[PDB]
Design a protein around this ligand. Structure first.
Ligand SMILES: CCCCCCCC/C=C\CCCCCCCC(=O)OC[C@H](COP(=O)(O)OCC[N+](C)(C)C)OC(=O)CCCCCCC/C=C/CCCCCCCC
Ligand SMILES: CCCCCCCC/C=C\CCCCCCCC(=O)OC[C@H](COP(=O)(O)OCC[N+](C)(C)C)OC(=O)CCCCCCC/C=C\CCCCCCCC
Ligand SMILES: CCCCCCCC/C=C\CCCCCCCC(=O)OC[C@H](COP(=O)(O)OCC[N+](C)(C)C)OC(=O)CCCCCCC/C=C\CCCCCCCC
Ligand SMILES: CCCCCCCC/C=C\CCCCCCCC(=O)OC[C@H](COP(=O)(O)OCC[N+](C)(C)C)OC(=O)CCCCCCC/C=C\CCCCCCCC
Ligand SMILES: CCCCCCCCCCCCOCCOCCOCCOCCOCCOCCOCCOCCO
Ligand SMILES: CC(C)CCC[C@@H](C)[C@H]1CC[C@H]2[C@@H]3CC=C4C[C@@H](O)CC[C@]4(C)[C@H]3CC[C@]12C
Ligand SMILES: *[C@@H]1O[C@H](CO)[C@@H](O)[C@H](O)[C@H]1NC(C)=O
Ligand SMILES: *[C@@H]1O[C@H](CO)[C@@H](O)[C@H](O)[C@H]1NC(C)=O
Ligand SMILES: *[C@@H]1O[C@H](CO)[C@@H](O)[C@H](O)[C@H]1NC(C)=O
Ligand SMILES: *[C@@H]1O[C@H](CO)[C@@H](O)[C@H](O)[C@H]1NC(C)=O
Ligand SMILES: *[C@@H]1O[C@H](CO)[C@@H](O)[C@H](O)[C@H]1NC(C)=O
Ligand SMILES: [Mg+2]
Ligand SMILES: [Rb+]
Ligand SMILES: [Rb+]
Ligand SMILES: [Rb+]
Ligand SMILES: [Rb+]
Ligand SMILES: [Rb+]
Ligand SMILES: [Rb+]
Lengths: 987, 262
């Protein structure tokens, strides 16, 4: 049903199947019935869920939901305490509001990660014609294309796009552009003749988006709407399931860890609180406070800030991301599936090789001409160059003198454009030179003569001869020659020269290149006077016994920076696969040229030819390289595709369909690969969507390709992929640094509540000041770890195992929580007891002191000296407690950020001051702390107190202890890599 | 195996127990040195006691402050007020006051040696006698029965705080909004002028003066109208007492609602 088989049906069979007439069309009535049966001939737009539902689910998620529940508990508390007329507990309203702001701001961060929010079927329906000409009841007229139905009889002419998928009945000189299917814009002939098994390859099927470049044809509408081949390409592009990026996986993972541990601590201490005498409402408030303390309210925000600071860096290299997650993925990539035409190559036919003087020469095919040229001293060469210059009909359009020769626009077919650019580049000015030798006679290329010819006055004032120049298919050019230019002389063409020619010609064929022969003849004045009347239809000139000059061959060459980029990715442990719709021989030649196939790699057919032994008997694992075509691939089983991918590290998939590209990508994925896809064409969009990351070419890319992509290369510099690999590996290694620093301080946020509950000391740390730490004083330091340089030689490392190397694993967690976080909590408590005692409250009096502390009916409570304190006085002293715990945590966070600068190296080698953003971050942290402490008013707005310098210093021994402890740990892992000390205390 | 091998679990566990004992010990030693730095007689800092709080007896709280309401006819409505007054005064008996001495200096009682028993400084007696009409005798209803009740105004003690020696610090009670209906609140204070004798100062702390008792002053409210809600403010007048704090209504003054139902 989906599959077109109508290319294999007689006209009788098609007329019966569709109920139509191959000359007069469908009846109007039956066309209307069919239109009501199948709907418009149009692509159905699959709309993604509304713009607000995106934001709604950005407001859920584990941390988000814990914050929700916490704000709900604050609102219930604020309601209950306002209902009994208690005005002091407005903190719960301020707290629920802050939490709600954090939820909403976090969800904004998660929503504005996706910049574009565009649809792909918009760009697909821009490839669709609006009108068609149809024959119904023998009346030919023009309708809207969406009114066409399966069975209609339709006319196409050169210039217009094909209105549906069509089985062709009549055609005159008709040629189409099938780049939306193959990525190749080479014109294809359409006839009514069935020339292939595949409807994708036969000449008598034409497709819906495609342009008819020339000629005229008539045919039966065989598929419409999403059933057309462009409709199915668009279905695959649009309808691929929302799969999460590697870093979303990592983020969701640590969110699950943290939400679980939060629910654990809240629930167990709520149980404990009720066991220990508190009332339900009070234990519920403890659960809210423990969730606020333990959860990192600022974390998701810091992560998307780090992702942004990497997106900025990439963007400065003309590498534009469409969503912050795509900033990581290339760093975790293990297989790259790459389009060839216009992705690895320039999509521009270029002169590549030359046969003359019995040797094959190589031309410089780079777009900058940054490469290796060939030898131009020969006089055979001067003659061949004269021939290929004078026998061209193309021309540069005017005023391009500033444009580089490869970019310049030429009026001519592909080959003549290539020859013209090669002329302009090799000798001075192709058109000026050309005008110096005036054409007196010419026949353009026919399918009858099978060559192109022109006869020319010479430039020399003295020389009165006429030079004839001719080009065409090599064997055809040869069978009209009798001599050949070899090393400054003209030899008769004996059998050995014909053999050498044929060998060279088939060699250049084997490199996937198109070959042209070029010949000459000088016509004397004694037979052709200076004004001889050269008339084409008379053929008064010879056209035989010509002098052969050389072969010139051409290919779509690699973009200059592509081959080194590919070896670089391979050095980073990334596999590179070619996935092209082009023909296999060209595919393999470009694969070899660009480094996808290494010097010395052999396919199974390669080995078979080397040993003159059948393919049957070649041992499959002896072949490092492999070239599978789309037909072969259609024939394989999934297991067979897997065994191929496992058996041959250097893999080329040629002549593949859009769906087949997606199938290769997903086969890699199912084997555990994180896959990137680099392309430029409509035929790449399905593989682009399905890839863990899709990179489109910015200049050469078609709109479907760019829309489906997650990254765009604005200057088409494939080397940018290598930049991306490095930044992704960097941002991952630095995010784990950033995150470890942010989680650490959650434990000394938590423990003061756990002690306050179970020990009933006056409350050491309030929820407002926790938020101030989480959302303000520690944020810039954690972000500054983004700018940390690489510790090791990251671009000679293998891609990370996605299943074993995670952003946050239990070593990082347990170290950050239950070692360093614990040291910080001990600091906080040491400072708390110091400030209490120095203000009159000995440690043992604090145990159980909480109820009298928090009693508004108790204005003369006695302290360890007997001094009498009001509730107000005690409350300010509580705020002093908050502040001294806050400063202990800040001071410890200075050491924290310093030791998170390096997971392996010592800070004595890299130094403390190399990262200057981090130093600015520390200074900003301390400044905003001083502001909070010593700006007047702060005691009655945010509960911060001008603490004494002693309590700034009290926690500093603990901070230094953190530095030293981590410094020694990392020494240990360096000196003892096999050790227990490595295997357990590395993170 | 359960996450790890059992041997690896034991080794990790002992490392964390070691880590935590070492850290707990470092902490304990911090607290120990802290308590050797701390002097047992004078606190290191008095950052939150720049001005003394003031409290009242009998302290009955409505919501958002002291609220006191009783009926002159039903003696059961003031029974508890007189009872907590009696029970507060229990520690100001001449027996309870045996640990203190008779001061007459009418001047700051500065002592820098410990001449009192068990290495102590002397502290001045304050006996309920000194409250006269508001002492529980001869009127054991503390003025409530007659609708002219006694409220006892105590000042929070602070180590080495001196209130000012040009005179004694006094109490002054008055109305918050002096009612256009009526005259100013008329008070008789015991002792006379509602003063705290200077020799009750400075306080040297619970270890130096274990038998210290805060001097009191009873305000006998004579003017209060019946069946009307009034608000009474009592401030301490001294050179070094402030009562302007908006975040502490009990700093240097005490306010309370009063209603004497008839
Ligand atoms: C995961 C497992 C975690 C395990 C956590 C364990 C935490 C426990 C660690 C230590 C326990 C307390 C150590 C106290 C050592 C006392 C040393 C000492 O001899 O000092 C004397 C004081 C008594 O004063 P004095 O009568 O002599 O004063 C008179 C003043 N003069 C001397 C001038 C006359 O002894 C005293 O205070 C006795 C009362 C001590 C105060 C109890 C305070 C309770 C607070 C606990 C919070 C701990 C948080 C830990 C955070 C862990 C993070 C994971
Ligand atoms: C299923 C999950 C695990 C659950 C663990 C439960 C652990 C054991 C729980 C309880 C056992 C102890 C029970 C004590 C006897 C009942 C106490 C009681 O009836 O109440 C009395 C007071 C609280 O009332 P009040 O006298 O102040 O009120 C008076 C009102 N007024 C102020 C006006 C006078 O009790 C006090 O304050 C003094 C008592 C202090 C005892 C602290 C014990 C520490 C408790 C738990 C820590 C264990 C955590 C384990 C974490 C494992 C996680 C994996
Ligand atoms: C996730 C990683 C974080 C790890 C943190 C987890 C936290 C879980 C810890 C749980 C430990 C709970 C310990 C419970 C202790 C209760 C002590 C107690 O209820 O004891 C009573 C006396 C206090 O004096 P009092 O009752 O006469 O004052 C009352 C004056 N009134 C009667 C006029 C009101 O305690 C004494 O004498 C001396 C008793 C010494 C208490 C030291 C407590 C330090 C313990 C652990 C830290
Ligand atoms: C592995 C190697 C790294 C660790 C070794 C380095 C730490 C020792 C080195 C230097 C310590 C002092 C550094 C300067 C900062 C002072 C911290 C502090 O002064 O802390 C002392 C607190 C009690 O403060 P305070 O009343 O003496 O203040 C005095 C206020 N004034 C003098 C103005 C009246 O008690 C305490 O932390 C505990 C004091 C006893 C010493 C144990 C330190 C444990 C820390 C770890
Ligand atoms: C590996 C390294 C690990 C080690 C970590 C080292 C971290 C170093 C960070 C640098 C810290 C800088 O510290 C600056 C601290 O400034 C404290 C200022 O102290 C002033 C003390 O004042 C006492 C407060 O008195 C309160 C009463 O004020 C009355 C007078 O007010 C006048 C106006 O002042 C306003 C409040 O002071
Ligand atoms: C110090 C005393 C009171 C607490 C002793 C409780 C024990 C059972 C606790 C305290 C610290 C805990 C460990 C903290 C760190 C880690 C490493 C992590 O990758 C797995 C969990 C694990 C291994 C925890 C297991 C349980 C643990 C060992
Ligand atoms: C300490 O002195 C007090 C005086 O306040 C006395 O009552 C007590 O008996 C003495 N205690 C001892 C142990 O001598
Ligand atoms: C206090 O007692 C004396 C003696 O009874 C009396 O004269 C005086 O009026 C009393 N004061 C008040 C306010 O009743
Ligand atoms: C008040 O105290 C001061 C202390 O500064 C003292 O010198 C002075 O003599 C005292 N004056 C009176 C009148 O008590
Ligand atoms: C305080 O008492 C004295 C007598 O010692 C008297 O002169 C003065 O007027 C009294 N002040 C007030 C306000 O009653
Ligand atoms: C005071 O008590 C009497 C007698 O019990 C009662 O009649 C009167 O209403 C009470 N006062 C008020 C204000 O209710
Ligand atoms: Mg392409
Ligand atoms: Rb937190
Ligand atoms: Rb062209
Ligand atoms: Rb000429
Ligand atoms: Rb393209
Ligand atoms: Rb994708
Ligand atoms: Rb995908």
């Amino acid at each position: 049903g989906m599959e077109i088989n109508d290319h294999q049906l007689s006209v009788a069979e098609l007329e019966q199947k569709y109920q139509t007439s191959a000359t007069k069309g469908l009846s109007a009535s039956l066309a209307a019935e069919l239109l009501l049966r199948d709907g418009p001939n149009a692509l159905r737009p699959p709309r993604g869920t509304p713009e607000y539902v995106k934001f709604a689910r950005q407001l859920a998620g584990g941390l988000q939901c814990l914050m929700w529940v916490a704000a709900a508990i604050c609102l219930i508390a604020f309601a209950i305490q306002a209902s009994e007329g208690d005005l002091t507990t407005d903190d719960n309203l301020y707290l629920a509001l802050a939490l709600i702001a954090v939820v909403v701001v976090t969800g904004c961060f998660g929503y504005y990660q996706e910049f574009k929010s565009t649809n792909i079927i918009a760009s697909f329906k821009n490839l669709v014609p609006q009108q068609a000409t149809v024959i119904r009841d023998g009346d030919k007229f023009q309708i809207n294309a969406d009114q066409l139905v399966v069975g209609d009889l339709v006319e196409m002419k050169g210039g217009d796009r094909v209105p549906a998928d069509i089985r062709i009945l009549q055609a005159q000189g008709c040629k189409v552009d099938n780049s939306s299917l193959t990525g190749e814009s080479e014109p294809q002939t359409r006839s009514p003749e069935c020339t292939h098994e595949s409807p994708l390859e036969t000449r008598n099927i034409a497709f819906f988006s495609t342009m008819c470049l020339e000629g005229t044809a008539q045919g039966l509408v065989v598929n419409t709407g999403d059933r057309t081949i462009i409709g199915r390409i668009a279905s695959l592009a649009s309808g691929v399931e929302n799969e999460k990026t590697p870093i979303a996986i990592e983020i969701e993972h640590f969110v699950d860890i943290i939400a679980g541990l939060a629910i654990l601590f809240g629930a167990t201490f709520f149980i404990v609180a009720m066991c220990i005498g508190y009332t339900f409402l009070r234990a519920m408030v403890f659960f809210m406070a423990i969730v606020v303390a333990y959860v990192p309210e600022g974390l998701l925000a810091t992560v998307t800030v780090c992702l942004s600071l990497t997106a900025k860096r990439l963007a400065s290299k003309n590498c534009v991301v469409k969503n912050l997650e795509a900033v990581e993925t290339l760093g975790s990539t293990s297989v790259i599936c790459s389009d060839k035409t216009g992705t690895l190559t320039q999509n521009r036919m270029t002169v590549s090789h030359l046969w003359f003087d019995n040797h094959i020469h190589s031309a410089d095919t780079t777009e900058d001409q940054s490469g290796q040229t060939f030898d131009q001293s020969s006089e055979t060469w001067r003659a061949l160059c004269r021939v290929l210059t004078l026998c061209n009909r193309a021309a540069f359009k005017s005023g391009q003198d500033a444009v580089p020769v490869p970019k310049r626009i030429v009026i001519g077919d592909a080959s003549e454009t290539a020859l013209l650019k090669f002329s302009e580049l090799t000798l001075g000015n192709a058109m000026g030179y050309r005008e110096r030798f005036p054409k007196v006679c010419e026949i353009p290329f026919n399918s009858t003569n099978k060559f192109q010819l022109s006869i020319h006055t010479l430039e020399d004032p003295r020389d009165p001869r006429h030079v004839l120049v001719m080009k065409g298919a090599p064997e055809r050019v040869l069978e009209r020659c009798s001599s050949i230019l070899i090393k400054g002389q003209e030899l008769p063409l004996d059998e050995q020269w014909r053999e050498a020619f044929q060998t060279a010609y088939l060699s250049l064929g084997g490199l996937g290149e198109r070959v042209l022969g070029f010949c000459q003849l000088y016509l004397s004045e004694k037979d052709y006077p200076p004004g001889y009347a050269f008339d084409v239809e008379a053929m008064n000139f010879p056209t035989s016994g010509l002098c052969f000059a050389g072969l010139v061959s051409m290919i779509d060459p690699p973009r200059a920076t592509v081959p080194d980029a590919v070896l670089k990715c391979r050095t980073a442990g990334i596999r590179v696969i070619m996935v092209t719709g082009d023909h296999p021989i060209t595919a393999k030649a470009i694969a070899a040229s660009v480094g996808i196939i290494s010097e010395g790699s052999e396919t199974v057919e390669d080995i078979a030819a080397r040993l003159r032994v059948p393919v049957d008997q070649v041992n499959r694992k002896d072949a490092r390289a492999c070239v599978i075509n789309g037909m072969q691939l259609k024939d394989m089983d999934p297991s067979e595709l897997v065994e191929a991918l496992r058996t041959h590290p250097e893999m080329v998939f040629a002549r593949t369909s859009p769906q087949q590209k997606l199938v290769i990508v997903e086969s890699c994925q199912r084997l555990g690969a994180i896959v990137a896809v680099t392309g430029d064409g409509v035929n790449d969009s399905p593989a682009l969507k399905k890839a863990d990351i899709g990179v489109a070419m910015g200049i050469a890319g078609s709109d479907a390709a760019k829309n489906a992509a997650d990254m765009i290369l604005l200057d088409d510099n494939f080397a940018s992929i290598v930049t991306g690999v490095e930044q992704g590996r960097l941002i991952f290694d630095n995010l784990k640094k950033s995150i470890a620093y942010t989680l650490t301080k959650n434990i000394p946020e938590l423990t003061p509540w756990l002690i306050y509950i179970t020990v009933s000391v006056p409350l050491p740390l309030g929820c407002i000041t926790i938020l101030f730490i989480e959302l303000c004083t520690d944020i810039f330091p954690s972000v500054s770890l983004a700018y940390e340089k690489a510790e090791s030689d990251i671009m000679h490392l293998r891609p990370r195992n996605p299943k074993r190397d995670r952003l946050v694993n239990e070593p990082l967690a347990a170290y950050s929580y239950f070692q360093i976080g614990a040291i910080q909590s001990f600091a906080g408590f040491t400072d708390y007891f110091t400030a209490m005692a120095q203000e009159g409250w000995f440690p043992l009096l604090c145990v159980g002191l909480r109820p009298q502390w928090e009693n508004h009916h108790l204005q003369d409570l006695q302290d360890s000296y007997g001094q009498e304190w009001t509730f107000g006085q005690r409350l300010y002293q509580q705020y002093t407690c908050y502040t001294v715990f806050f400063i202990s945590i800040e001071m410890c966070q200075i050491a924290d950020v310093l030791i998170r600068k390096t997971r392996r190296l010592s800070a004595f080698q890299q130094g403390f001051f190399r990262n200057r953003i981090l130093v600015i971050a520390i200074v900003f942290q301390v400044c905003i702390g001083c502001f909070l402490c010593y700006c007047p008013g702060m005691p009655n707005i945010f509960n911060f107190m001008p603490i004494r310098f002693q309590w700034w210093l009290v926690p500093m021994p603990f901070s230094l202890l953190i530095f030293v402890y981590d410094e020694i740990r990392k020494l240990g892992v360096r000196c003892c890599p096999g050790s227990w000390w490595d295997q357990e205390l590395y993170y | 195996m359960l996450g790890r091998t059992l041997s690896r679990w034991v080794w990790i566990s002992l490392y964390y127990v070691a880590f935590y004992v070492v850290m707990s010990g470092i902490f304990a030693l911090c607290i120990y040195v802290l308590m050797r730095t701390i002097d047992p007689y004078t606190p290191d800092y008095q950052d939150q006691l720049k001005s003394p709080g003031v409290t009242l007896r009998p302290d009955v709280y409505g919501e958002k402050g002291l609220d006191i309401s009783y009926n002159v006819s039903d003696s059961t409505t003031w029974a508890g007020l007189a009872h907590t007054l009696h029970r507060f005064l229990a520690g100001y008996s001449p027996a309870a006051q045996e640990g203190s001495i008779n001061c007459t200096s009418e001047k700051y009682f500065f002592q820098e040696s410990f001449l009192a028993p068990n290495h102590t400084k002397f502290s001045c007696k304050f006996t309920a006698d000194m409250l006269q009409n508001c002492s529980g005798r001869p009127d054991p209803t503390f003025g409530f029965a007659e609708g002219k009740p006694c409220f006892i105004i105590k000042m929070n003690r602070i180590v080495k705080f001196l209130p000012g020696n040009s005179t004694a610090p006094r109490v002054d009670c008055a109305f918050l909004d002096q009612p256009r209906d009526g005259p100013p609140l008329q008070v008789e204070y015991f002792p006379a002028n509602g003063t705290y004798s200077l020799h009750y100062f400075p306080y040297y702390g619970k270890k130096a003066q274990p038998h210290y008792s805060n001097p009191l002053v009873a305000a006998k409210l004579l003017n209060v109208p019946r069946n009307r809600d009034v608000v009474i403010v009592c401030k301490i007048l001294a050179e070094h007492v402030s009562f302007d704090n908006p975040h502490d209504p009990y700093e240097g003054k005490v306010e309370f609602k009063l209603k004497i139902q008839k």
